[PDB]
Structure formats: structure tokens, C-alpha cells
Amino acid sequence: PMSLIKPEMKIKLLMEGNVNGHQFVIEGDGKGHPFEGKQSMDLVVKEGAPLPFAYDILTTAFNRVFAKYPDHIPDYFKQSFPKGFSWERSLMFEDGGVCIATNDITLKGDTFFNKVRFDGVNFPPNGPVMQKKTLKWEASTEKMYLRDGVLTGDITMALLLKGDVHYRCDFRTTYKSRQEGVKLPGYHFVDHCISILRHDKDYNEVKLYEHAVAHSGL
Amino acid sequence: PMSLIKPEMKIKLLMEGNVNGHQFVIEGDGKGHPFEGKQSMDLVVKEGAPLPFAYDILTTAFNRVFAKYPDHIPDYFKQSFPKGFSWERSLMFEDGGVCIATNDITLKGDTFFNKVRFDGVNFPPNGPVMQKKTLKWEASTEKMYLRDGVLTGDITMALLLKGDVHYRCDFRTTYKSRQEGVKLPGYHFVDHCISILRHDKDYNEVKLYEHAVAHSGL
Amino acid sequence: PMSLIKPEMKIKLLMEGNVNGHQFVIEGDGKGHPFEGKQSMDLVVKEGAPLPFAYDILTTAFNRVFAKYPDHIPDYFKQSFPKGFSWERSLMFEDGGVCIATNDITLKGDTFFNKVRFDGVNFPPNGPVMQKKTLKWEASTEKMYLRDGVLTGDITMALLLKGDVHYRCDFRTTYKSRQEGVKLPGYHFVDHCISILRHDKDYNEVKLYEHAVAHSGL
Amino acid sequence: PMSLIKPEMKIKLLMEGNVNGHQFVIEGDGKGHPFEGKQSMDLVVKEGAPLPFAYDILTTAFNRVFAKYPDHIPDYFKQSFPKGFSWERSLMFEDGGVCIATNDITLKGDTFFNKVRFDGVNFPPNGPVMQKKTLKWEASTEKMYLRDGVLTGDITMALLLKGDVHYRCDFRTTYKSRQEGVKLPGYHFVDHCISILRHDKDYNEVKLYEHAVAHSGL
Numbered sequence: 001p002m003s004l005i006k007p008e009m010k011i012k013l014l015m016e017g018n019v020n021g022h023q024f025v026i027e028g029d030g031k032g033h034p035f036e037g038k039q040s041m042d043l044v045v046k047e048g049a050p051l052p053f054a055y056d057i058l059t060t061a062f063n064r065v066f067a068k069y070p071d072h073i074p075d076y077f078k079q080s081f082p083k084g085f086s087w088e089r090s091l092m093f094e095d096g097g098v099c100i101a102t103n104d105i106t107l108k109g110d111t112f113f114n115k116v117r118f119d120g121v122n123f124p125p126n127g128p129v130m131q132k133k134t135l136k137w138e139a140s141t142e143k144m145y146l147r148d149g150v151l152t153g154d155i156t157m158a159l160l161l162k163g164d165v166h167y168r169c170d171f172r173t174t175y176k177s178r179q180e181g182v183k184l185p186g187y188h189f190v191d192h193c194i195s196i197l198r199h200d201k202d203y204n205e206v207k208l209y210e211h212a213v214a215h216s217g218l
Numbered sequence: 219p220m221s222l223i224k225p226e227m228k229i230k231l232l233m234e235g236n237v238n239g240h241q242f243v244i245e246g247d248g249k250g251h252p253f254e255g256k257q258s259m260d261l262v263v264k265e266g267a268p269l270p271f272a273y274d275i276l277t278t279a280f281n282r283v284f285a286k287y288p289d290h291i292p293d294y295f296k297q298s299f300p301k302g303f304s305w306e307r308s309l310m311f312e313d314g315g316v317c318i319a320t321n322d323i324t325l326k327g328d329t330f331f332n333k334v335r336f337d338g339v340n341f342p343p344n345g346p347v348m349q350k351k352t353l354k355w356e357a358s359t360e361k362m363y364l365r366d367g368v369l370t371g372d373i374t375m376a377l378l379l380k381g382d383v384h385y386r387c388d389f390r391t392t393y394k395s396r397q398e399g400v401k402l403p404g405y406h407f408v409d410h411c412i413s414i415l416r417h418d419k420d421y422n423e424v425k426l427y428e429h430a431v432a433h434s435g436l
Numbered sequence: 437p438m439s440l441i442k443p444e445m446k447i448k449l450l451m452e453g454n455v456n457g458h459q460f461v462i463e464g465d466g467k468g469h470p471f472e473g474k475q476s477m478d479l480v481v482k483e484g485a486p487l488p489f490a491y492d493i494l495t496t497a498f499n500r501v502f503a504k505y506p507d508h509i510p511d512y513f514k515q516s517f518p519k520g521f522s523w524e525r526s527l528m529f530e531d532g533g534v535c536i537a538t539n540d541i542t543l544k545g546d547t548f549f550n551k552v553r554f555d556g557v558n559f560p561p562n563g564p565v566m567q568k569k570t571l572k573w574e575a576s577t578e579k580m581y582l583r584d585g586v587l588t589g590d591i592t593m594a595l596l597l598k599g600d601v602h603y604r605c606d607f608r609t610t611y612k613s614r615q616e617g618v619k620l621p622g623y624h625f626v627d628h629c630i631s632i633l634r635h636d637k638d639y640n641e642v643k644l645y646e647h648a649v650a651h652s653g654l
Numbered sequence: 655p656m657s658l659i660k661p662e663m664k665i666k667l668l669m670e671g672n673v674n675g676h677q678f679v680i681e682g683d684g685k686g687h688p689f690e691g692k693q694s695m696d697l698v699v700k701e702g703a704p705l706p707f708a709y710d711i712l713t714t715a716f717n718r719v720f721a722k723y724p725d726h727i728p729d730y731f732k733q734s735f736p737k738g739f740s741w742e743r744s745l746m747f748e749d750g751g752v753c754i755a756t757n758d759i760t761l762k763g764d765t766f767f768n769k770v771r772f773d774g775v776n777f778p779p780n781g782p783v784m785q786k787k788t789l790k791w792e793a794s795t796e797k798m799y800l801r802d803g804v805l806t807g808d809i810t811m812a813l814l815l816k817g818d819v820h821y822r823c824d825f826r827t828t829y830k831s832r833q834e835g836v837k838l839p840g841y842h843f844v845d846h847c848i849s850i851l852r853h854d855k856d857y858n859e860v861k862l863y864e865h866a867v868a869h870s871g872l
């Protein structure tokens with residue numbers, strides 16, 4: 001595919017989730033610059049407010065199209081349109097918490113639509129997630145490669161916690177395009193930095209931003 | 219609590235799930251002998267038939283009330299009524315597949331009602347689960363203990379596959395009672411044996427059975 | 437093989453180890469009843485005394501011959517003589533500690549000789565292992581099966597700590613016989629209970645005991 | 655400490671190891687440019703030749719001093735002299751193989767001396783490691799942070815195998831300086847690229863090279 005994605009795109013998102021039994025719905029309205037690998041979004045909790053867990057666990061669920069890919073690495077994501085692609089992710093936290101997030105991404109006009117599901121279980125009640133002790137995800141480098149023919153990104157993630165300590169989470173995301181004839185990339189990397197730019201007291205309203213750049217390491 | 223659960227009880231269940239993008243709904247009608255630790259259930263796929271993955275990954279999601287507890291070990295489950303209890307489980311397969319299952323169990327008359335959710339992601343497309351190469355779960359021994367005050371069961375599970383080889387899965391289930399004043403047990407074990415007694419060609423109809431016995435090891 | 441192992445056997449052992457940089461040597465003199473699955477041993481720290489870490493992490497390194505096997509399950513271990521067998525084990529603790537233990541077991545007369553190596557790394561300095569806060573390993577059930585043709589035992593292990601909490605460790609042991617024509621068992625279980633019967637203040641002298649019984653579950 | 659490490663340094667190394675029961679000794683003679691983050695080494699198998707497993711599993715055991723650190727990130731390694739530092743590492747492969755590597759690094763004149771130990775267990779006999787099917791480690795990005803006060807590096811590593819597929823290994827290295835008053839860095843990254851430049855048929859003689867650069871991501 002010869003991508004027709006534009007330098008400026010809009011984003012609409014709906015997330016339905018359940019973490020440690022707490023049900024919630026979050027709506028997102030955003031935009032981004034696909035070729036610059038930058039995007040931002042306004043998130044609003046529509047059901048389940050106020051959330052009783054760390055908002056940070058949800059943020060990476062709020063689209064690799066927004067990553068700056070150099071010409072020498074096939075861009076699986078920008079090639080995946082007009083039909084779109086979906087992804088599945090496991091988030092395994094070091095204290096036993098486990099989450100699964102999925103997103104089905106489609107395109108209508110210049111807007112990407114995202115149908116997101118997020119489920120989390122086994123978080124210790126007095127742990128940093130249920131006690132809202134997280135400050136941010138540190139920047140990261142995602143390792144992209146094919147597993148049984150499916151593009152997969154593995155990441156060593158870490159949440160900085162109050163008290164200046166880290167809490168590790170291992171990510172595995174599988175990406176599946178619905179577009180025919182996509183050229184698959186070889187082993188590569190995608191640097192990321194996700195940030196909550198601002199938020200209200202209970203995180204009912206959050207401004208999120210991500211910068212991502214693909215590269216060949218070394 | 220002084221349990222009023224009877225020697226014969228009925229079971230009603232509804233599971234909504236999504237594995238590797240495949241959505242499905244399964245209804246269960248069963249019964250069991252709580253004090254003998256035995257139960258059986260008739261399962262029918264109501265939506266999403268025929269399932270494109272190994273039915274076995276779902277079976278343990280289809281109630282520890284059905285486990286023979288000796289008098290010297292507090293029975294967290296039989297004490298959890300009339301209000302009921304819920305559980306959350308992570309299933310981590312050795313080839314990357316990850317599932318989360320949850321069940322909210324309630325009681326009406328002599329019938330346990332089960333609201334079950336099952337989500338699975340990252341299964342390799344040519345793996346034993348997506349290729350339906352499983353034969354059964356082997357019997358197991360669940361290790362029960364408290365983690366940050368929450369009763370937790372960890373298990374070394376294994377699926378026997380065609381070709382006489384095994385496929386490992388690690389289970390962690392957290393159990394949370396809604397009943398006040400429940401007496402918590404110390405570290406103990408629960409032996410299990412779950413079996414599909416019979417099924418039709420595509421597993422649209424399955425007869426399931428479980429035998430479970432709690433003990434103190436040694 | 438038709439085992440000539442006797443109902444009463446002796447044991448000689450030498451362990452060379454290094455945990456978090458601390459080098460040590462421990463000698464063991466013991467005995468056991470192979471067909472009853474019971475054994476005991478006197479252990480003496482010969483170098484590296486006093487150990488600065490929890491002695492309990494070492495104890496399972498101090499022979500599955502000492503397990504009561506029923507007639508219907510092939511006994512890989514009692515069949516492994518006179519040539520002997522060796523085993524390798526990874527111990528993965530939940531806070532990042534990782535140990536590898538190995539033992540080459542031989543037989544001379546009525547005495548099993550054990551050449552043991554134990555290495556442990558990445559234990560947090562203020563963790564329960566380096567701070568000697570363990571009380572005992574809980575009893576366990578080892579799941580025995582073949583992995584790529586090699587007998588393997590996976591176990592959900594747990595150390596009881598001071599303060600009435602548990603610290604999890606996952607075990608994987610691979611067993612390899614040097615005896616020709618050994619009949620391999622199918623999937624089965626081995627219940628264990630290991631205990632330090634008594635010890636001096638710094639654990640320079642320890643009396644250890646293990647009871648183990650193989651079975652088919654259910 | 656105000657580092658006196660020079661732009662050109664020499665390296666002497668001795669590794670004693672045992673993988674899946676195979677004992678070996680390898681000697682290394684090399685050199686590097688600490689401030690450029692580049693080093694190379696000539697490795698010779700002195701005992702245990704020819705190795706029956708993939709040489710690649712050993713290569714990262716053959717010193718973070720050789721990493722280009724920018725001025726804004728404290729360099730734990732170049733500050734660790736003249737007394738030196740040591741490190742411990744767990745290598746957890748996706749098919750069950752587990753290795754532990756350790757290195758005690760000292761300095762005499764302009765030469766770093768390395769006392770290395772490498773132990774590996776539980777590798778499937780027909781797996782890529784025991785069958786020598788690896789081609790190289792892909793480049794990587796190590797995530798550096800403090801865990802219970804100890805500098806730790808976690809990495810998502812991957813070995814490229816014959817047949818154009820990847821084999822994952824998770825690394826955790828803990829670094830411990832013997833030098834007093836070292837300024838600890840905050841969360842950061844170290845990009846790496848390790849390569850076998852050339853080797854003889856059985857890998858008895860190997861020319862190894864590494865390029866590494868520390869950065870703050872984004």
C-alpha cells in the first residue's frame with residue numbers, strides 16, 4: 001500500500017474497561033501528526049468516576065500509526081489503511097497484576113476510530129496501582145519483530161512511583177492488519193514517551209500526549 | 219458463617235468472551251455436590267459458533283464451593299453465602315498466550331448463578347490453541363494462600379496435546395468474598411481434575427465435570 | 437532396570453555455592469528409606485560461615501530416589517542405577533532473585549554421592565532472603581512430565597516468612613539418567629514436605645528432613 | 655569520583671562455565687575506547703572444545719565502562735575505579751533455558767581484569783541453543799534503574815535464528831560498585847549492539863565487538 005494518511009489526522013476513541021472489579025467507560029477526542037510520531041488526546045471518564053486505581057495503567061491503550069518511521073523500515077501501520085488494523089496487548093506487572101487491552105482501529109475521512117477494551121485483575125489492594133501511587137511511565141523502547149508471522153512488540157516498561165522507586169511491567173502487543181499486501185518489517189525498534197500533560201483531581205479529565213520514533217538501533 | 223449450602227445444588231452460567239478477536243457467548247446449566255467436591259455442567263455455544271480455538275482453554279472458567287474441604291481447613295467458599303463471592307484469574311501460557319477470566323457468583327434458592335467473562339490474546343496463529351490441538355488439562359494441585367490479605371490460588375497447569383506432549387499454563391486466581399466475618403484459611407492445597415466427558419464435533423455442546431479436594435499436603 | 441536400591445541407604449554430599457557474591461561450601465552426611473520416600477541429613481558449613489542469606493533457599497538442593505513411587509508409575513530415579521543421574525534446577529523468586537542448582541548423583545556401595553553447585557543472584561539487599569526472614573518452605577506438589585524428551589518437574593513453591601506472609605518461587609528441575617533403557621513415566625505428581633528439624637544459631641549446623649510421595653492426582 | 659579511565663584501555667578475561675552439563679573455560683584478550691562505548695576481544699576456548707551449544711548465549715558475559723555516557727547522566731561505571739565493580743545477570747530464555755552470569759571487574763595499570771562465571775540449565779536438547787541454530791543477538795536497549803538501591807538493567811533481548819525467526823531472552827543485570835561515594839544515575843537507557851566479527855568453524859576462536867551508548871530516551 002502507498003499510504004494516503006495525512007500529516008494531520010483526528011482521533012475518536014471509546015474505552016470500556018474493568019479493573020479489579022471496577023467498571024468504567026472513557027471517551028477520547030484527539031489528533032496527531034502521523035509522520036512526526038506525535039499525538040495528543042482529551043480523555044473523559046463517562047462511567048465509573050472517580051476511578052479507584054492509577055490512571056497510568058490505562059494510558060498506552062489510548063495507535064502505532066503515530067510513530068515516525070524512517071524510509072528504510074517498512075511501516076506496517078501507515079500501510080494498514082483504508083481497512084485498518086487491530087492490536088492486542090498483555091501487561092504483566094511485577095506484583096501479579098495482569099491486564100489485557102485491545103483496540104480495533106478504523107478510519108473514516110481523516111479520523112481514526114478506536115474501539116478499546118481494557119481488563120485488569122490480581123492487583124494487590126494495597127499495591128501502587130490500587131493505591132494510586134504512580135507518577136508516570138518512563139520513556140521506553142519497543143522491540144518489534146514477527147512471532148509466528150504476526151508483528152509483535154515486546155517492551156520493558158516501568159512506572160515511576162511516589163518515593164522515587166520503579167514498578168515494572170512487561171508488555172507484549174500483537175498487531176494485525178486487515179489490509180492486503182502489507183510489506184512486513186524486520187526486527188526494529190520504536191522509542192516512546194507517553195505523558196499525562198495535565199489532569200483534574202480525580203483524573204475524570206486527562207490531557208495525554210505521546211511521541212514515538214522508529215529506528216534500527218546501534 | 220455457618221454454611222447452609224446443601225449437599226445438592228444447581229448451577230446457571232453465562233460466559234461472554236473474546237479470544238484472539240473471536241467473540242462468543244456460552245450458556246451453562248449444571249449441578250453439583252458441594253461437600254463431595256464434584257460438579258457437572260451442560261455447555262452450549264449461543265454466539266460465535268463454531269469456536270476457532272481449543273475449548274479446553276475455557277473450561278476452568280466454568281466455583282471453588284465445589285471442593286471437598288476437611289474440617290481443619292476453613293472453607294472460604296462455603297462461608298461466602300448468602301452474599302456470594304467473585305474471582306479473577308490470569309492464565310499465562312508458555313507460548314505467549316494470555317487470558318483473563320472473571321466470575322461473579324451469586325445464590326438464589328438452591329442455584330448458583332455465574333456471570334463469567336473470558337478474554338484471550340497473543341495466541342500464535344499456528345499454536346496448539348488456535349489450531350485446536352489440545353486433548354485435556356491434566357489433574358492439578360492448586361496452592362492456596364493469602365497475598366496482601368486476598369485469598370490466592372497459584373497453579374502449575376498443563377494441557378496434554380496431540381502427539382503426546384504438554385503445553386504449560388500458569389494460573390493465578392484471586393478470590394474475594396462479599397460475606398462479612400469469613401474465617402480465612404492458612405496455606406493449603408486443592409487437588410483438581412477437570413474433564414470434558416463428551417462433546418459434539420465442534421464443541422457447540424459440551425458435558426463438563428470437575429472433582430476437587432482440599433488438603434494440607436505432606 | 438530392575439532396581440537393587442535397598443530399603444536403607446546412606447548419603448554423602450558436597451555443595452559449592454555463591455549467593456549474591458558470598459561464596460560457601462557445605463558438607464552433608466545423611467541417610468534415607470527410598471521406598472518410604474523419607475530422608476534426613478546433617479549439614480555443616482565448611483567455608484563461608486556464617487551465611488548472610490536465608491538457609492532455606494538451599495535446602496531442596498540437599499534426590500528424587502527418596503520418593504515413594506506406586507507400582508503404576510515408572511520410577512525414573514530408582515531405575516537410574518548403578519550409573520546414576522543428574523539434575524539441573526532454576527529457582528525463580530518473585531522479587532527477582534534467581535538461582536541455579538545442579539547435582540550429579542552417583543552410587544558406591546549403599547551410599548549415594550552428591551556433587552552439588554548452587555548459584556544465586558539478583559536478590560534485593562533488603563529482601564527476605566538477604567535479610568534472613570524465611571521460616572520454611574511450605575509443602576508442595578511437583579508436576580512431572582517430559583519436555584522435549586527430558587523428565588521435568590515444575591513446582592509452585594512458597595516460603596513462609598516472618599509476619600505471616602508468603603514469598604513465591606517457581607521451580608523447574610530437569611532430570612537426566614545415565615542408565616540405559618530406563619522406562620519413562622507419563623504425567624504425574626510428587627508431593628513433598630521439606631523441613632529443617634533443628635539448627636544452631638547461624639545455621640552452620642542443620643538437620644534436614646524430606647518426605648515425598650508420587651501419585652496420579654485426582 | 656573523578657574518573658582517570660583513559661580513552662584507550664586493555665582487557666583480560668577468564669570465563670569458567672557449565673551449560674547443560676558441559677564444562678568449559680574461555681580466555682579473552684581485548685581492548686576498547688571507554689568514552690566511545692566500543693570494545694573488541696579475541697576469545698579462545700581453553701577447555702571443553704568444541705562447545706556443543708550456541709556461542710551467542712555467552713557473548714554478553716564477555717563491562718558497562720564501555721558505553722558512551724553523556725554528561726547529564728551519572729556514569730556509575732567510570733566512577734567505579736580504582737576499586738572496581740561486579741555484576742550479576744540472569745538470562746531467562748523463552749523455552750525454559752536459564753543462565754546466570756557474573757563478572758568481578760578489577761583494574762591494574764590500564765587493563766581491566768574480568769573473572770567471569772557462566773552457568774546454563776534447562777535448555778531443551780533439540781532447542782536452538784543446544785542445536786547451534788543462533789545467528790546473532792539483535793541490537794538492544796537496556797533500561798537502567800535502581801531496585802532496592804542497586805543499579806539494575808532490564809533488557810528485552812532476542813536471538814535471530816536460522817530460518818528467519820527470533821528467540822527471546824529476558825535479561826536482568828545488577829551492578830555493584832566497590833568504590834565509595836559513587837553518584838547514582840536516575841532512570842536511563844543504554845543502547846547496545848554486540849557482534850561476533852569472525853570465528854573459526856567450531857567457535858574455538860572468536861573475535862567479538864560491542865558498541866553501546868547511554869541516553870535519556872524520548
Ligand code: NI
Binds near residue numbers: 001002
Ligand atoms: Ni506497493
Ligand code: NI
Binds near residue numbers: 199
Ligand atoms: Ni499531576
Ligand code: NI
Binds near residue numbers: 219220
Ligand atoms: Ni461463626
Ligand code: NI
Binds near residue numbers: 417
Ligand atoms: Ni473428544
Ligand code: NI
Binds near residue numbers: 437438
Ligand atoms: Ni526391564
Ligand code: NI
Binds near residue numbers: 635
Ligand atoms: Ni529455628
Ligand code: NI
Binds near residue numbers: 655656
Ligand atoms: Ni566528586
Ligand code: NI
Binds near residue numbers: 853
Ligand atoms: Ni559465521
